[PDB]
Structure formats: C-alpha cells, structure tokens
Amino acid sequence: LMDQPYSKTDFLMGTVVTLKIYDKGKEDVLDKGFDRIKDLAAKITTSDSEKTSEVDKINEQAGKKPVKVSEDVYYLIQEGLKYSENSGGSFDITIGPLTSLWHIGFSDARKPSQAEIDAVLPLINYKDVKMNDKDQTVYLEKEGMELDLGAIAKGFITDETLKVFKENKVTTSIIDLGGNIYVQGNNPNGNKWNVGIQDPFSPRGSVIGKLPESNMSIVTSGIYERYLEVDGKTYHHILDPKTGYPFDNDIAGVSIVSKKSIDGDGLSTATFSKGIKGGMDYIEQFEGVDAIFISKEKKVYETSGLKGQFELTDKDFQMDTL
Ligand SMILES: Cc1cc2nc3c(=O)[nH]c(=O)nc-3n(C[C@H](O)[C@H](O)[C@H](O)COP(=O)(O)OP(=O)(O)OC[C@H]3O[C@@H](n4cnc5c(N)ncnc54)[C@H](O)[C@@H]3O)c2cc1C
Ligand SMILES: [Mg+2]
Ligand SMILES: [Mg+2]
C-alpha cells in the first residue's frame, strides 16, 4: 500500500468524479474504472443532445415497441422497479416526463404551468414498465412515458466501478462520484476511512462531521445542491409524482450508509418523501442500512445502527434524538 495514491479526476455526468487507488502497481486500473463509468453513463443518460442512449431509445418507443437493452441497463431498470414498488410509488423511475419538464439543475430549468404538470402526472406509473427476461427488452406501455434513472444510476455505477477494482485485485481505494462515495479497505495507516458527512447548507465538499467507515458506501441527498429559484420560491430536484412539485418537509439532507451503493442511492427518494421521523422509521426496516438525517433547523439524527458513531464538528448543528 502507498501513502500517496494514484488519483485521477474528470468531470462526468455533470459533476467532478475522482478515483483513488492505494495499491502499488495498479495505476492503470484508474483508466479501467473511468472507462467503465463512461460506458455506463452513455447507456443511461438522457442529457446528451447528440446521442441516443439506451434509456432514450426506450422512451422514444413508449407505447410503440419493446426495446432491446444490454445487461447493464436491464439490471438497473430491474432494481429501479423494485425500489419503486417498495416505496409505494413515491420513488418512481417513470417520473421521466415530470423531471424532464422541470429540468431542475440545468441551464433551462423552468417552473411549468399547472396544465403542463397535469398533462404528465397520468404518465407516471412504474407498473407500466413491461419487462421480458428472455428477449431482454424493456417496454413502456403508454405513449409519452419516460424513464429517469438518475436517482439510482450513480449508485449502480459506483458498485460497478468497485467490481472493476476488485477484478483487478485492488484492495484499498476511494470512489467519489459526487454525492456517491465508496471507501474500500482502510486508510494505509490502519485507521478506518473518515468519511465526511455533507453539509446540506454548503457546497459539495463542506462537511458537518466525520463517520469512520470501511468497505462501505455513503450516498447523500439534499435540497440546496440542485434547485430552481423563481419569484422568491425555490424548487429542489426531488419531485412528488402525485403532485408534480418537490417533496417539502423537514429534511435538508440525508446520508445513507450501506454495503452496496445502489441500495443507499435507491432508498434515498422514498426516505426523503417521509420526512425526518418517517424517513428514520423507513431506514430502520432495512437491516444493514443506516442514515444520518439533517433537519432544516440544523438538527442531526442517527438511526439505530449508527448511534454514537458520527463525530459532529460543525457547531452550527446540534445532535438530537427522537
Ligand atoms: C448518467 C447520468 C448523466 C448525467 N449527465 C448530466 C449532464 O450532462 N449534465 C448535468 O447537468 N447533469 C447530468 N446528470 C445529473 C447530475 O449527475 C445530477 O447532479 C444528479 O443526477 C442528481 O442526483 P443526486 O445523486 O445528486 O441526487 P439523488 O437524490 O440521488 O437523485 C435525484 C434525481 O432523481 C430523479 N428524481 C427526482 N424525483 C424522483 C422521484 N420521485 N422518483 C424517482 N426519481 C426521481 C431526478 O432526476 C433527480 O435529479 C447526469 C446524471 C446521470 C445519472
Ligand atoms: Mg444519487
Ligand atoms: Mg439516490
């Protein structure tokens, strides 16, 4: 193990992505990881105007014909439908027509008319995604439907990047997709990795404390990173499929701790829709998954499996219990 790692930084999927590898003689695995990230991003994205991704092709043929997909895309949609059903529909990967309408976080973000919202709300239904295992096809049964895998894609890509690392016998690494972090092994000095818990009121990178972890994923969601401000009001990017407007409760941010990044990524939307106390109860039903909640009043809460582990450092915030 090296003290100073091999590291590479790129700007993919609209954010800074950094990979670090501490195993001596594994520098070329950095390129293998970024190759895998770019491969999956091109299959999943709906934000490339000059190319038609696999998800784009599914959306173009909604209500027309099933679309052949690769194993990566078939699996991601498979899991997205599982998180959608488990959420009761609060999380729904068919929210595509609504999230494309607002386009929150992009240069052309817009608050749509109520008539525009009412036109896309009947299109959101995860049960209308028809899957054929033998043909490996995905079919949107209704015209106008659109998939949006943005809430689970980074977790899946993070897991697949770790798979490339493990296949190359990498033992000590840090995968940072911006809001999706996986720490592999321990610090070369023997300590657990001190993972920073994002400050939801400050730009990405600023933290309110540290969580020691090893071989674990930490995924972050918040309201102040991607939002649109019009006429005094702000609208964050986590939208309610039943109303067409953002989920507005007492959560400012939440960090979900899990063995697999797709699980923490996929559980975030349903957890977010339930507020602080309801979201904590939701996380307590998943063994091996825990979370740190941060209120709009700067109160910090730990689920049962994380009690006493989080090291709060920002004095603007206070630890609180239920
Ligand atoms: C493959 C890919 C390519 C991208 N390319 C670009 C790019 O070129 N330019 C750019 O500016 N951004 C791009 N992005 C978006 C960028 O990565 C965002 O910062 C990020 O996707 C926001 O998600 P999050 O993980 O930070 O938060 P999360 O909470 O994990 O994800 C929130 C996202 O999930 C979706 N969502 C919202 N409400 C719901 C709901 N109720 N149910 C289900 N899903 C919901 C929306 O897409 C929302 O943005 C891309 C994203 C992906 C996955
Ligand atoms: Mg995410
Ligand atoms: Mg997520």
Numbering used by the authors: 37 to 358
Provide text from the study.
A Mg2+‐dependent protein flavin mononucleotide (FMN) transferase (FmnB; UniProt: LMRG_02181) in EET is responsible for the transfer of electrons from intracellular to extracellular by hydrolyzing cofactor flavin adenine dinucleotide (FAD) and transferring FMN. FmnB is a flavin transferase belonging to ApbE family; it hydrolyzes flavin adenine dinucleotide (FAD) and converts flavin mononucleotide (FMN) to pheromone lipoprotein (PplA; UniProt: LMRG_02182), and divalent cations are required this process. Here, we report a series of crystal structures of apo‐FmnB and FmnB complexed with substrate FAD, three inhibitors AMP, ADP, and ATP, revealing the unusual catalytic triad center (Asp301‐Ser257‐His273) of FmnB. Notably, the structures of FmnB in complex with distinct inhibitors, together with biochemical assays, revealed that all three inhibitors indeed inhibited the activity of FmnB by occupying the binding site of the FAD substrate.
As defined by unbiased electron density, FAD in a bent conformation binds to the central cavity of FmnB with the diphosphate nearly perpendicular to the adenine. The adenine of FAD is buried deep in the hydrophobic pocket inside the cavity, and the isoalloxazine ring is exposed outside the hydrophobic cavity. The adenine of FAD forms hydrogen bonds with Ser126 and Leu275 of FmnB and establishes water‐mediated hydrogen bonds with the carbonyl group on the main chain of Asp184. Additionally, the sugar ring of FAD forms salt bridges with His273 and Arg262 and hydrogen bonds with the side chain of Asp184. Instead, the isoalloxazine ring is sandwiched between Phe142 and Met49 through the hydrophobic interactions. Remarkably, Arg262 not only forms a salt bridge with the sugar ring but also forms water‐mediated hydrogen bonds with isoalloxazine ring, which likely maintains the curved conformation of FmnB‐bound FAD. Moreover, the diphosphate of FAD is inserted further into the FAD‐binding pocket, forming hydrogen bonds with Ser257 and water‐mediated hydrogen bonds with His273 and coordinating with Mg2+ through Asp301. Two Mg2+ ions are present in the electron density model, and they are coordinated with the phosphate groups as well as water molecules. In addition to these interactions, one of the Mg2+ ions (Mg1) coordinates with Asp301, Ser304, and Ala187. Glu261 adopted a rotamer conformation that removed it from the catalytic center through charge repulsion, and Arg262 no longer occupied the position of the sugar ring but formed a salt bridge with the sugar ring to stabilize the FAD conformation.
